[PDB]
Amino acid sequence: MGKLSTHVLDITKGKPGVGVKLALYAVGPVGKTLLKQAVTNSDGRCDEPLLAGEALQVGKYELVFAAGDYFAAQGEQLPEPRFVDEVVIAFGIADASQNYHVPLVVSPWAYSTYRGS
Amino acid sequence: MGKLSTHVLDITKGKPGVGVKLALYAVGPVGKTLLKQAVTNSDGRCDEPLLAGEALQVGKYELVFAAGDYFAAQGEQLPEPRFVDEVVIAFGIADASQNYHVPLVVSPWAYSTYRG
Amino acid sequence: GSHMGKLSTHVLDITKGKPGVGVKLALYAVGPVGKTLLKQAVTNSDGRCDEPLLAGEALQVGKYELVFAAGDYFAAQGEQLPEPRFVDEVVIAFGIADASQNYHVPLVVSPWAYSTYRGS
Amino acid sequence: MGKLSTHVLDITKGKPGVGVKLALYAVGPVGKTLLKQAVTNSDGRCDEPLLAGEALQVGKYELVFAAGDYFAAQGEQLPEPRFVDEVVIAFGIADASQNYHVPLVVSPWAYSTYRGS
């Protein structure tokens, strides 16, 4: 069974992003539907897969990371609106049998994502 | 006076992303407002800045890159829905007097962005 | 020396969205007396190494270089690129300051770009 | 005709890396040859191209950046040896007629490069 997972990495300290609030949305033609909310654990991942089994369906999604609140909780005092506040990763799942690992490699001034393994 | 600019780089071929359609949005409490549509030129940039002068205001923004259409137009046939289709780059501008360069370094399976 | 640390890597092919399978690599220690070859490996079907590159008492404080034969990998995948390839052997130099901790240094690579970081 | 250039970006503050010392080497079968030593300017670039005209030839090169020294001068207090100290970017130039722009997007715990434009 394919599963959707994520991983937040803080490249300002080379450490997992701990406590990063995130939300998963299913995206359709008329609107978006919240599927799940989660908080990254001590390894920067989620204790449970964001989607697994029959819940992982072919479609379009959005992973929204509260990266700005995280860096503010780490002591960063940045002028608002921060350049990196809520990071929105829009992506599509075309094959429900394959795993989809969509991490976030983020600083207050940069971020990158990819389809990992 | 500050200006907003972007730049698209295709890392499957090490060339600028040419012909990438763009849509810039201001994001507020009640919703989003379309500010500008544009297309990347032969250098993967815009002939005019996305925002400049008084049009560059303090606030939240969303710069959407029609990257999936670009890679489909380059011959890359990929099953639907594509992992990289419309790339949403949400960011904030805290100082209207500064230049903000928000490029995109993109493949069909990865993208990166940063404040340049 | 500590027994608890381990050096690892992970090759991700972002032209395919798949792990880089069959990529040859070598680990070097780098110091004032030169570079010392420590291990050669080939990435498995998950783009990782079946055995750790360095771990435990063999994992020591100092400078290191991981060398990825990215150019041969992409050539083996059908990419026809004029030589010398822009991305051929990728050299990731990095330092290890605490021998008891784990260091995961992955490679996110295309024939025209790559990135690396200290992961978890 | 072709020109080789670079650009250092500090993604910990969202600013160009200013004062970054660098060195360009040619890489051949019998050893490496220093081509140029330079320092980034206020825009994180070099006032002159690293290689231009007849100096730009087909072959392998290495750009070495003293990134760790730069982060020390910016106040970052990291144990030694730093995870990121001297960043080595090995790359090959196949067509001396084309411009090659090879930037460095770096934090003390991450870096990326690409064939830019």
Q: Rounded to an integer, what distance in angstroms lies between the CA atom of residue C10 and that of residue C16?
A: 15
Work out whether the CA dihedral B27, B32, B35, B36 comes out positive or negative.
Answer: positive
User: What are the distances in angstroms from CA A101 to CA A60, A113, C7?
Assistant: 15, 10, 22
| CA distance from start to end of chain D | 15
Amino acid at residue number A5: S
* A7 annotated ligand-binding residue: yes
Q: Rounded to an integer, what distance in angstroms lies between the CA atom of residue D72 and that of residue D94?
A: 36
Give a yes or no: residue C120 inside a domain: no
Question: Domain total for chain D?
Answer: 1
Interface contact C97-D111, CB threshold 8 A: no
Give a yes or no: residue A117 inside a domain: no
Q: Which residues pair with B3 in a beta bridge?
A: B52
Q: Distance from A44 to chain C by nearest Cα, in Å?
A: 8
DSSP string, A40-108: --TTSS-SS-SEEGGG--SEEEEEEE-HHHHHHHTT----SS-SSSSEEEEEEE--TTS-EE--EEEET
Task: Give resolution in angstroms.
Answer: 2.2
| CATH code, D81 | 2.60.40.180
Interface contact A14-C46, CB threshold 8 A: no
Which technique?
A: X-ray
Q: Rounded to an integer, what distance in angstroms lies between the CA atom of residue D17 and that of residue D45?
A: 8
DSSP string, C35-58: EEEEEEEE--TTSS-SS-SEEGGG
Give a yes or no: residue C1 inside a domain: no
Give the 3-state secondary structure of residue B54: helix
**Max Cα-Cα span within chain D:** 44
Give a yes or no: residue A96 inside a domain: yes
Q: Rounded to an integer, what distance in angstroms lies between the CA atom of residue B54 and that of residue C106?
A: 44
Give the phi and the psi of residue C116 in degrees, each rounded to 5: -145, 160
Give a yes or no: residue C118 inside a domain: no
Give a yes or no: residue A59 inside a domain: yes
Give the 3-state secondary structure of residue D113: strand
Residues of C in contact with A114 (CB under 8 A): 12, 14, 17, 108
> Which domain range does residue A66 map to?
3-112
CA geometry: angle A52, A53, A54, nearest 5 deg: 115
